[PDB]
């Protein structure tokens, strides 16, 4: 159980994949722009609650989504609709973060947590789309939430759920997250529900998907 | 009573220069944004430049970029334009307004007369 | 050389309805906002966010969007509403701010 809270570079795992990087950058957008663009997010994105499938069941996601690209992206077994016209402002930050980190993306996912009740629970990015080992920013507006992450166990511990090393993150209104590296192969994510009142929160990945 | 005080304008000639000031009484800046607009006399308004001054991003418009250069204080919360090269066509009254969002502009200004001439 | 246009007009009596329509093509934001200027005087801003009424704005005015169509209509005319409307076209974060065509309206006689 690791907690980080401070800006800076951490190797959070070095195997068996190899090394596991993520890269914190608190304040990279400043107060007041943050609440604009999240006032400005939260009214021109066309949000939506889409539904999920798991196993021959069907509900609908806790949470409302939109997709940004010129290709599409399929988890939970639904595909999203790729808007081929990026949202001016998404444009710039995408623009911000590239010449800032050095890595390129082509493809965003927009999540909305619009209070305490919703989440997205465990899973690891690895759609085959995104490629070996892709490169995946996340940049958060609105209320904290809580980014858990849990190392997966190895094949001969039959995916022992728990005693696995548990890492928590809180990303804070305007914080940039860069996961690169094993991340996605070696690691799974959540944000869990919380227990008291939380605002809106808005969130955006970006990611580079292949043909 | 939360007025908004412009200063500086008057008459040059084409090519010279000018250094609008604006004055934030009654209330404060900062995390706001500090437009400049002005307005040729039976025009429509034009939008010149912006400023948050949080971050200090300035943006301007097409027809002044490298010329203009829009500031702000918070130490003396006084807005600054320095306009340079001007021309002709500069010759408006320049208004200041405010805006707790990033556009729209609740307090504004009575407005200076700039005049560039030979 | 010109920057702007004149203000087009609009001939109408009181207690007419005026809707005065505001053109953007492209347009995926609602921040839209909304002008008046009367002769001499600086500009006061009635509507913001393409729909919500500023705080000391008679209840007469109402904005409304219509996919990439903006309007600001008023319900009753009032002897105090003759004057020039400016539309602000939708004003995205980080990037410039244009001012549309002024609308004078002008009482008929």
């Known amino acids: 159980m690791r907690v980080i809270d401070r800006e800076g570079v951490y190797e959070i795992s070095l195997s068996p994949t190899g090394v596991s990087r993520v890269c914190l950058y608190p304040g990279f957008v400043d107060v007041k722009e943050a609440d604009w663009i999240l006032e400005q997010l939260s009214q021109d994105v066309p949000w939506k609650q889409r539904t999920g499938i798991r196993e021959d069941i069907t509900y609908q996601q806790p949470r409302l989504t939109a997709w940004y690209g010129e290709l599409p992206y399929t988890y939970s077994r639904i595909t999203m609709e790729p808007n081929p016209h990026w949202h001016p402002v998404l444009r710039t930050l995408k623009n911000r973060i590239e010449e800032n980190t050095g890595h390129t993306f082509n493809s965003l996912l927009c999540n909305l947590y619009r209070n305490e009740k919703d989440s997205v629970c465990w899973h690891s990015d690895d759609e085959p789309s995104l490629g070996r080992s892709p490169i995946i920013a996340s940049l958060s507006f609105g209320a904290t939430r809580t980014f858990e992450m849990r190392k997966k166990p190895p094949p001969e511990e039959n995916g022992d759920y728990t005693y696995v090393e548990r890492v928590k993150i809180p990303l804070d209104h305007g914080t940039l997250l860069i996961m690169e590296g094993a991340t996605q192969a070696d690691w799974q994510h959540r944000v869990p529900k919380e227990y008291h009142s939380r605002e809106p929160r808005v969130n955006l990945t970006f990611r580079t998907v292949y043909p | 009573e939360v007025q908004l005080v412009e200063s500086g304008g008057g008459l040059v000639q084409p090519g010279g220069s000018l250094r609008l000031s604006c004055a934030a009484s009654?209330?404060?800046?900062?995390?706001?944004?500090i437009h400049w607009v002005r307005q040729a006399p039976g025009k429509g308004l034009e939008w010149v430049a912006y400023?948050?001054?949080?971050?200090?991003?300035?943006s301007y418009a097409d027809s002044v970029k490298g010329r203009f250069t829009i500031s702000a204080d918070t130490s003396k919360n006084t807005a600054y334009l320095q306009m340079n090269s001007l021309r002709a066509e500069d010759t408006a009254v320049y208004y200041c307004?405010?805006?707790?969002?990033?556009?729209?502009?609740?307090?504004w200004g009575q407005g200076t007369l700039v005049t560039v001439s030979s | 050389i010109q920057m702007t246009q004149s203000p087009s007009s609009l001939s109408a009596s009181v207690g007419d309805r005026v809707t005065i329509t505001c053109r953007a093509s492209?347009?995926?934001?609602?921040?839209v906002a909304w002008y008046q200027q009367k002769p001499g005087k600086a500009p006061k801003l009635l509507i913001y966010?393409?729909?919500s009424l500023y705080s000391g704005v008679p209840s007469r005015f109402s904005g409304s969007r219509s996919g990439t169509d903006f309007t600001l209509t008023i319900s009753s005319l009032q002897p105090e509403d003759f004057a020039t409307y400016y539309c602000?076209?939708?004003?995205?974060?980080?990037?410039?701010?244009?001012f549309g065509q002024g609308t004078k309206v002008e009482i008929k006689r």
């Open positions: 307004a405010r805006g707790d969002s990033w556009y729209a502009m609740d307090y």
């Open positions: 009654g209330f404060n800046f900062s995390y706001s944004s």
């Open positions: 400023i948050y001054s949080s971050s200090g991003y300035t």
């Open positions: 492209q347009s995926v934001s609602s921040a």
């Open positions: 966010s393409a729909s």
């Open positions: 602000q076209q939708p004003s995205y974060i980080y990037y410039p701010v244009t």
